[PDB]
């Protein structure tokens, strides 16, 4: 599933996103926007062999079970497609252990590199939420 902005938004928010850990939508919109162009299918292959999958391509190197990364873990306890569902659930509840590892949002280093500071609000200006 292709997702539209406010779309995205709304879902988001309706499964506890919004400001998780003090990061406002805007912040996890933008993260979703430039992992993923908000594709629910998307994933890239890392340089170490891990992949990342889903609206916020979370790793296989730690959260997901792809069965293909070696000495790998699975913190999610989730096989790696369930975050390429087009329902979102599985991708938020990971996400929030995920923010929560002691790193916030730089955990995605598109965040950090593409939202961060930002004017994150852009993201979500317009939505009906
Ligand atoms: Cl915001
Ligand atoms: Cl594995
Ligand atoms: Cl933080
Ligand atoms: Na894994």
Redesign the pocket.
Known sequence: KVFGRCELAAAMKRHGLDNYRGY????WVCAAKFESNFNTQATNRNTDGSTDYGILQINSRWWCNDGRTPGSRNLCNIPCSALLSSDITASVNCAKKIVSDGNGMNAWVAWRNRCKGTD??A??RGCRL
């Not at 406002?24 to 912040?27: F, I, Q, R």
Request: hydrophobic share 50%; proline share 0%; aromatic share 12%.
């Open positions: 406002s939508l805007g912040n994150v609000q993201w979500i």
